[PDB]
Write a protein that binds this DNA or RNA. Structure first.
Lengths: 149, 134, 49, 62, 210, 49
RNA sequence: UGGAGCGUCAAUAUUCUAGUAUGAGAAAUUAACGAUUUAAGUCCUUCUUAAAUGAGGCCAUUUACCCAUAGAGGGUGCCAGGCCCGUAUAACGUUAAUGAUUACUAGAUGAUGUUUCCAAAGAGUCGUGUUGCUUGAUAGUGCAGCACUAAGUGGGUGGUAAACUCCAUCUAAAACUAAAUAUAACCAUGAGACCGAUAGUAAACAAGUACCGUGAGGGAAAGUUGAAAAGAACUCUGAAUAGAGAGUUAAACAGUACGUGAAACUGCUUAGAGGUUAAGCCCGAUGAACCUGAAUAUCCGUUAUGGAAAAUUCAUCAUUAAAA
RNA sequence: UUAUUAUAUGCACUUGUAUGAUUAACAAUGCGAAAGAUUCAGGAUACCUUCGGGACCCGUCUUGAAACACGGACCAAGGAGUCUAACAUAUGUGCAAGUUAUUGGGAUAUAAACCUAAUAGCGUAAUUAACUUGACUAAUAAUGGGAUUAGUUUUUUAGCUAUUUAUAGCUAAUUAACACAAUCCCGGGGCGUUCUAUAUAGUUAUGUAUAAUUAUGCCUCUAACUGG
RNA sequence: AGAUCAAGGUUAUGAUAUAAAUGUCCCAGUGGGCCACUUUUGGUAAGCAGAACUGGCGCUGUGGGAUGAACCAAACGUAAU
RNA sequence: ACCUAUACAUUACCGCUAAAGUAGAUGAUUUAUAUUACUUGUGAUAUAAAUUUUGAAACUUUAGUGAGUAGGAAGGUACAAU
RNA sequence: ACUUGAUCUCGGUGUUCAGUACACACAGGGACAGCAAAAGCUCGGCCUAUCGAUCCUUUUGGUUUAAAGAGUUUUUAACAA
């Protein structure tokens, strides 16, 4: 299924030692099978290129379950693409019968972080969580970061 | 869409008339509208209505019926068929070549078309000659 | 840009029938790019099934 | 080119060629105070290249 | 050997070549399984083609609070709470499975009203065609009314996208909901050590009487 | 891999191509979210360029 | 994940369900299977002269002999839709399954709340200790052996051992059970970017054969005359298989190494030559032999000038009709 | 003043010299010759004949092979860098904060193609051993800022071709502006760890003040929170 | 030590530019060397042993030294002069 | 004096490497001549004849230049199938 | 004479160098100190040797984080030297 003329064997055939050397022939396994031995005769290769192999840092959690750390993330950077931008122009006349209502857990997200630099309208954000800067940089604009259940 | 340069880079190499022959670096089209039979870009089946050629006859020897391009009344989405028109000069072996320069002025094939009608009129002739030697 | 650009495709019927009053417009796939390099690369692969 | 063939009143820009994350790994001696260049791990966690040669307790700090 | 590449872990040391599965009959198991559904939907009846009723919402964990485990039960209170016929529900095709110990009012209602939506569209063939207690009809016998055996029995499937553009637009939005979270966590952190302090404050005064 | 088989549309075949691959103006209805591909060069006639 | 009876409320009870006979349907449907029909040219000329399946021809029907829901495949002296078996649609046929009604068989009135009434439930087993194997299973994941050996608001589990308070969750130590799932074997089929007789199975064939080993076991080689045997009569010579004539075929340069028939190696003929690098060989030439390629409108011009023929949308031509 | 040199040769017309990698004029020889067929040149094609010159046997390992190194008598068939899995880079292609039917389902013409719901991977946000925590003063900003910047706008100046002397192109002199990409410096944030400020007052609520969890006062025992 | 202004002539030895600068693939091979001038250590010496510099051989044919891996000339597309 | 290399040099040819040029052909360009604006003089117009495609993946111009194992890259070439 | 700087902390440099790690050394910032009237000097030995990963065991440190149904205590583990 792979175009063989561009493979080297179509081309190296036939000069004699097939690209692998007269002195230092292509033998079976001249260094070790696999990660042998990254602690004796491959150690330079294993630190560089992978510092941190060969130890134990520690706290064992027998049977981690991947729900107790779920918490999907969203910054204030989006937050307003979740309502339409075509529903951003109308509150940008200016006219504030709004903040809107954003229910970030109905979308998929829990943690509202604060990267952001979001506009001067208020928002009403029902998410399950907070950043310190998500609470500030919303309530400065008027609205409120609110707890989803 | 349709332009003779987009049409040609699709056709340039994967053609069905181009039939290159074995040393000669990439030429020959066996087209019915080529008149200098290589494959250039502007000797070609469809180059979109610069498509003139020179055909005999049907009656050998007098004619050369000339399929003149059937032009820009056509897209050339086809025509309730028109697009080959076949005005065929006759009757004088070296007057009609003036009457082909006189006919068309599409100055790109012009000296390579009456270069062909001559080379048909060179060929259809030789019946009552090449005889006796008594 | 256009979708129209040659915007009348006549319909024909069994007796070679140029004439209808039905003249439908060129349906705008026919301006989209011809790319034989991607067609050949989808064809290479899809007929391996 | 049919409008500005010479390019009068145009702004010819290009996004960053090393924006991408293949470029994050070029090139790596741990032992210099400036590498910061992203190994080829399979997965992010503890017990994945995080122990000996990264921490001053286990082994050394790179 | 050589280079900066990604320590390998391919698990090919165990005479694996005798464990290989082909998948070349992926297509004619799709064809087998489909010709059986056609076979089985005709060998029922006008009866629905899937077809049980399959209750729930509320898949368990915190990821899927909402996207269903696929409802085995209908948990006999929901039958008894919905006008049937607990043994009888099985004879229709309601799938009565008596292992679920319904833990909510609202989950019990969610399926009771599901058991009222269907059973209001569930047409009933009579037995002896006198039909003293129908409750639906015999002129809504399926030839007259439906005869459909339509294909899916849908689950009403989960709105939440949304976004419903509202004014609340609060006045008492002066309340520090980021710090209720910091206050809630330590409340749950120090339950016991407050309760130990709620022992010495309940016992140091008993050293005053003696 | 070779584009352009000689093709014959019937009438109600031809009148559906503005739905399948939708149009230049609007997307398609029969292919969810599909949007006709845009060429790298819209005018594509060099000899008039 | 329990019940049994009572009160009890509601509905209701010539009744339906299950089953065997059941002719359902004036054979009715559906499915299997063998079927069963070949639809349509062996129509005319050419090469084979050994054979057309090839090659050319067949009014028109906007040009195609005919059929085509049948241009899958195979057989036929060469490449066959129309020669033949089939193929497509189907009929035809025997099977089966859907039992309408009727009979006997056998069973059966609840579901509904309530609090009354007795409201149980698997031990040398669980579990602990220890040992051994085992697992991702970690102060034990499973399993087993041995000493110990239970309880009944009990007992198990709740990925960190331990007491103590609770919470959550199921009911061990007894029994069944279709479907999805698996399939180098067995019956019966259809395929393929596979191999093409040193390949593919070892084996395309009298192949697990011939042979070898005391045994266990081991294990080959081996396809092709031609369309048809028309398989060479007969004659001569021989002691003879055989040779030489003859015969057969399109062909014996297809005669049982039977299609092709390569190389290696060589008997014979013809050519030239021979005491040195052993021979080969490179480069320049050579004798012999064979061979390949070769040219027409001008100096100090595609100029001066006379003869014929035919003919013309050409003229100074003119109208006219188009189609671009 | 003695000399010297250049400029002041248009119109025609030559077979003239030069210069377009400066070879061409004159003759001789011989007819592509209808099929038929000679002349002149050439042919180490692949050999034989005659001489001269050169010329060690290949493959291999090796510092070094013609080697008194190993394999090879010769010939035909066979005969050795592959499938897979997972990465990484480069290039091609599709879509782009996304993308990816393919486990399945549906349509259905047939192990294809088409269509498609719920997910799911990977990406979009990270860092801690962990619990915590979670990305620029700000409704705006590409390492914020700084250099070195290709390029577009722009400055006036003589100025160049055209000039109507309008309008271009040109160099720059040179003004200003944004400065893409890339690298080089200085920052700033997230998280971690550490020092340090709090002597802390104080910032918000429980509490507290009252009414009736509730209402409002306000101190702050308490928790939260600010700081370099 | 810096951030913005002011002044600065003709850009501050010579000769060079077969293009230089920079990433990635740290991709192939290699990680047995031998020879030589001058320097040099061990050995009595060695066509021995071990180092420093430059150039070669390895990988390299051709001319010369009758002969030769390194010597002296010279580095190699096919040809004429 | 003279002989002698695959060196030096000048030329033909092959490749490489590095530059440079060409695409309005219902256009460009000749040669004449009729007319002409006329600027004396040279252009513009009509006629008659003539030349003027290239797989632009092409064509044209110019200069330097050529050792090679192990080894890498490009372009061809044989075999068989879809 | 008097002393504990033979201390505590954060990075950086020299050497070995692959320009990796230990180890030794050095130039500093922070803190706490010693001697000295002060300036100053001291981060062991006047300078060039006097040394040792992972895993495991261990101890000292937080007034620590975790044992994933919930509380407290034992225990085990983690992190730093």
């Amino acid at each position: 299924m792979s175009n063989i003329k561009r493979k080297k064997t179509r081309k190296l055939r036939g000069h004699v030692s097939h690209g692998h050397g007269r002195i230092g022939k292509h033998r079976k396994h001249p260094g070790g099978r696999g990660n042998a031995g990254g602690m004796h005769h491959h150690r330079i290769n294993f630190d560089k290129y992978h510092p941190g192999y060969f130890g134990k840092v520690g706290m064992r959690n027998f049977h981690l379950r991947r729900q107790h750390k779920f918490r999907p993330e969203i910054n204030l950077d989006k937050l307003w693409s979740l309502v339409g931008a075509e529903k951003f122009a109308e509150l940008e006349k200016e006219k504030s019968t709004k903040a809107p209502v954003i229910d970030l857990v109905k979308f998929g997200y829990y943690k509202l972080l604060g990267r952001g630099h979001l506009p001067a309208r208020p928002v009403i954000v029902k998410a399950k969580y907070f950043s310190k800067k998500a609470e500030d940089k919303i309530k400065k604009a008027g609205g409120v970061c609110l707890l989803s259940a | 869409a349709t332009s003779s340069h987009l049409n040609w880079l699709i056709i340039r190499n994967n053609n069905a008339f181009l039939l290159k022959k074995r040393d000669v670096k990439k030429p020959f089209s066996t087209e019915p509208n080529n008149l200098a039979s290589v494959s250039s870009y502007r000797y070609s089946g469809i180059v979109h209505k610069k498509t003139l050629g020179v055909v005999p006859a049907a009656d050998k020897k007098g004619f050369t019926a000339v399929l003149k391009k059937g032009k820009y009344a056509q897209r050339p989405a086809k025509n309730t068929v028109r697009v080959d028109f076949k005005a065929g000069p006759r009757r004088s072996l070296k007057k009609l070549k003036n009457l082909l320069i006189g006919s068309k002025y599409r100055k790109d094939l012009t000296q390579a078309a009456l270069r062909r009608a001559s080379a048909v009129l060179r060929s259809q002739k030789p019946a009552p000659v090449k005889g006796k030697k008594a | 840009s256009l979708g129209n650009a040659r915007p009348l495709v006549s319909v024909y019927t069994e007796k070679n029938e140029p004439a209808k009053d039905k003249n439908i417009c060129l349906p705008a796939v026919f301006k989209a790019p011809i790319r034989p390099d991607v067609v050949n690369e989808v064809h290479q692969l899809l007929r391996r099934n | 080119a049919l409008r500005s063939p010479t390019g009068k009143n145009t702004l010819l820009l290009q996004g960053r060629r090393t924006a991408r994350t293949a470029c994050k790994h070029f090139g790596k001696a741990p032992g210099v105070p400036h590498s910061h260049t992203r190994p080829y791990v399979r997965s992010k966690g503890r017990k994945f290249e995080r122990a000996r040669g990264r921490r001053s307790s286990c082994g050394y700090k790179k | 050997g050589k280079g900066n590449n990604m320590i390998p872990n391919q698990h090919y040391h165990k005479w694996w070549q005798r464990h290989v599965k082909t998948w070349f009959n992926q297509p004619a198991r799709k064809v087998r399984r489909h010709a059986n559904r056609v076979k089985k939907a005709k060998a029922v009846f006008p009866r629905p083609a899937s077809g049980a009723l399959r209750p729930v919402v509320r898949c368990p964990t915190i990821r899927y609070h909402t996207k269903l485990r696929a409802g085995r039960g209908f948990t006999l209170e929901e039958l008894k709470g919905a006008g049937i016929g607990a043994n009888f529900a099985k004879t229709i095709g309601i799938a009565v499975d008596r292992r679920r110990k319904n833990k909510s009012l609202e989950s019990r209602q969610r399926n009771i009203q599901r058991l009222k939506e269907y059973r209001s569209k569930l047409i009933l063939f009579p037995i002896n065609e006198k039909k003293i207690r129908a409750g639906e009809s015999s002129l809504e016998e399926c030839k007259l009314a439906t005869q459909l055996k339509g294909p899916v029995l849908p689950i009403k499937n989960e709105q939440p996208a949304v976004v419903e553009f509202r004014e609340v637009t609060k006045d008492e939005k002066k309340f520090k909901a980021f710090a209720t979270l910091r206050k809630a966590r330590t409340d749950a952190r120090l339950v016991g050590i407050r309760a130990k302090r709620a022992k010495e404050a309940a016992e140091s005064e008993d050293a005053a009487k003696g | 891999g070779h584009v352009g088989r000689f093709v014959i549309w019937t009438e109600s075949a031809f009148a559906r191509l503005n739905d399948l691959f939708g149009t230049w103006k609007k997307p398609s209805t029969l292919k969810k979210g599909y949007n006709l591909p845009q060429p790298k060069m819209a005018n594509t006639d060099l000899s008039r360029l």
